[PDB]
Design a binder for this molecule. Structure first.
Ligand SMILES: Nc1ncnc2c1ncn2[C@@H]1O[C@H](COP(=O)(O)O)[C@@H](O)[C@H]1O
Ligand SMILES: [Mg+2]
Ligand SMILES: [Zn+2]
Ligand SMILES: [Zn+2]
Ligand SMILES: [Zn+2]
Length: 646
């Protein structure tokens, strides 16, 4: 079996740390229970000849160990030592070093407050002292990343909650999101405006060596140029990262698969499923058997593909935004190795119903019969599947909350109540559809959504303090284009509604630097409120939420900003709850499903569960609520359609 790449084991950590051992401070030590797996396989099977480690024939000393049955290194494919293995290299503006000398140069740079690019398991990282405000601001400036939170590597898990330390110390060694109150050493530029910080432990030997030496928290963010995939070769690192890093700690062991760090919450919730989980297969739900090989292309953002066959499914690693420059290459190498590993040959392809998608283009190039699944249908089905809902389980009411996904008849959805099973998706109601002014700009400039909401629902909106920056502009040009439907399509988007409220509270920059920035900011503000008595509501009118009443109560309910943000979450949860209750109860349905990237909001989840405690509630947990889980939803719907003989 090939298993995920795994965190350095305590045995290897002790060997690396003991003077006189052959692998004393060898940054490439591993054995049978730890080290890189998926990321070092060129083709099958898992044997030195077909890994990256065929380029390093074992010296006589390591040869003895490979043979020995009692040795912890019986058939450790990588193995090797400082005599025959890869070795570290350092490169920096007319400096070069190697081995221990290279390590020590990197350490000194990090101590000086500089930024170093470090070769990891599934790509490169950019690192600096997370306590040093100038270094972090310098890293942000050079990377053009003014706000998106930075991951941080801690030398030990001391002082973190039990749940976080448990998760951090697993062989997967994910980044775990933790209240930043627990980590006061970090500067404010790590996760500015947010309540959580993603922390991680050293999980390869080079990281261990570094942290033992530095004894402090280090930024440890992806070594990518913005709008580009992480570099996996030395050459690409050195080219992409030359204007960002002050030095490079690299090495001559190739990486053959891109494999980002995984991200989970301390709660257990999966956010990004990569290193340490891939390529583990998942069992399909009861009733799903003898399924033909289907390739599911997933979503254009936060992409994963899925391979469905027999009674199992295997997701790819996080591949990111499919319009990034060079991502198709990484996607295709992932699919090549994944097909090799599972001896998998697709007979069918499933992709999203949106004809504008990149993924949809790639499907047409395949020469297999193709089929289409509605975005939000796939979100709901991926949740049902994670909960092992049987093939013949019966209908649920689903709430699918995200930015924008294409719905029935070309509509733009993102705030929908649906009747769902594995074959059918009936649209029942949800948020009203409201223009996206300036098209793609509406996701980058929250105020555009406040304007759209105000022109639809808010009499005399120019008189409220919270619309002041919009009201003072020449907004009528844009209002005229909205009215005429010029690059102003309607979308029933939960994401855009959060953006309109964050624009009204001033809690995000006027123009965002990352997708969902304003929504995260608004959730972070709300989360600082313990709960408040307030009069804001979102009443049901027929099958839609009455936003005119929401806005009038919300704009006129003065309160500390954190209470205003909490009241929005509570009112939204209560309005969708009333909708889903009406719809489920009058259909004899007892189970509700929640999915879509907005369902990553923990406060909304808490409020929905509070209001809907009279139902069985299904929320995502081990796959992401967002687009990273979409390929699995497409897979089970394709499977169910086939199993029904359609
Ligand atoms: N904490 C949050 N609260 C509300 N909305 C969010 C949150 N995080 C992400 N979103 C929205 O959901 C979208 C991602 O959904 P998806 O495309 O399903 O992965 C983002 O672009 C945001 O518009
Ligand atoms: Mg602490
Ligand atoms: Zn080991
Ligand atoms: Zn050796
Ligand atoms: Zn989505």
């Amino acid at each position: 079996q090939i298993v995920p790449d795994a965190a350095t084991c305590p045995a290897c950590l002790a060997e690396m740390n003991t003077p006189g051992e052959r692998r004393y401070r060898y940054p490439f030590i591993n054995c049978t229970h730890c080290g890189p797996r998926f990321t070092i396989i060129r083709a099958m099977p898992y044997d030195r000849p077909f890994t990256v480690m065929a380029a390093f024939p074992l010296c006589p000393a390591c040869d003895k160990e490979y043979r020995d049955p009692l040795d912890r290194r019986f058939h450790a494919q990588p193995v090797a030592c400082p005599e025959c293995g890869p070795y570290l290299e350092w490169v920096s503006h007319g400096e070069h070093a190697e081995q221990e000398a290279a390590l020590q140069a990197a350490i000194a740079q990090l101590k000086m407050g500089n930024i170093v690019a470090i070769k990891g398991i599934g790509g490169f990282h950019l690192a600096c002292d997370a306590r040093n405000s100038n270094a972090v601001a310098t890293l942000r400036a050079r990377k053009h990343r003014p706000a998106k939170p930075l991951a941080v590597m801690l030398p030990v898990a001391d002082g973190l909650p039990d749940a976080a330390r448990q998760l951090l110390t697993t062989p997967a060694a994910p980044i775990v999101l933790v209240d930043k109150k627990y980590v006061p050493e970090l500067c404010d530029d790590i996760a500015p405006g947010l309540n959580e910080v993603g922390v991680m432990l050293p999980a390869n030997p080079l990281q261990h060596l570094l942290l033992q030496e530095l004894q402090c928290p280090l930024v440890m963010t992806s070594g990518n140029l913005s709008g580009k995939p992480p570099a996996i070769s030395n050459e690409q690192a050195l080219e992409d990262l030359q204007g960002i890093a002050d030095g490079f700690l690299i090495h001559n062991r190739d990486i053959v698969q891109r494999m980002d760090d995984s991200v989970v919450r301390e709660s257990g919730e999966m956010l990004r499923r990569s290193r340490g989980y891939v390529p583990d297969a998942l069992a399909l739900p009861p009733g799903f058997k003898n399924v033909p090989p289907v390739l599911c292309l997933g979503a254009d953002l936060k992409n994963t593909f899925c391979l469905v066959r027999g009674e199992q499914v295997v997701l790819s690693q996080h591949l990111g935004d499919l319009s990034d420059d060079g991502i198709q290459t990484q996607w295709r190498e992932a699919l090549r190795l994944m097909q090799n590993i599972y001896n998998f040959t697709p007979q069918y392809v499933v992709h999203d119903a949106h004809p504008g998608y990149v993924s949809c283009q790639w499907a047409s190039e395949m020469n297999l019969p193709t089929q289409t699944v509605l975005h939000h249908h796939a979100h709901a089905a991926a949740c049902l599947a994670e909960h092992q809902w049987p093939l013949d389980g019966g209908d649920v009411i689903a709430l699918t909350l995200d930015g924008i996904g294409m719905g029935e008849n070309g509509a733009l959805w993102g705030g929908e109540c649906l009747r769902v099973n594995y074959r059918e998706c009936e649209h029942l109601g949800g948020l009203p559809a409201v223009a996206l002014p300036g098209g793609d700009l509406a996701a980058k400039q929250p105020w555009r959504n406040l304007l759209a909401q105000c022109l639809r629902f808010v009499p005399e909106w120019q008189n409220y303090p919270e619309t002041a920056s919009v009201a003072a502009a020449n907004w009528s040009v844009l209002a005229r284009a909205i009215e005429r439907g010029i690059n102003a399509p309607l979308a029933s988007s939960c994401g855009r509604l959060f953006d309109a409220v964050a624009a009204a509270l001033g809690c995000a920059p006027a123009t965002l630097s990352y997708e969902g920035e304003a929504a995260c900011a608004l959730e972070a503000l709300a989360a600082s409120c313990d709960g408040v008595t307030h009069p804001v509501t979102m009443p049901r009118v027929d099958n839609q939420l009455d936003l005119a009443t929401f806005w009038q109560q919300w704009l006129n309910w003065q309160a500390p900003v954190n209470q205003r943000a909490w009241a929005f979450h509570d009112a939204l949860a209560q309005g969708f709850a009333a909708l889903m209750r009406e719809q489920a109860t009058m259909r004899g349905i007892t189970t509700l499903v929640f999915s879509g990237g907005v369902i990553h909001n923990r406060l909304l989840r808490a409020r929905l569960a509070h209001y809907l405690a009279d139902f069985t509630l299904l929320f995502p947990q081990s796959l992401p609520a967002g687009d990273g889980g979409l390929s699995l939803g497409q897979g089970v719907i394709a499977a169910a359609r086939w199993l029904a003989g359609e």
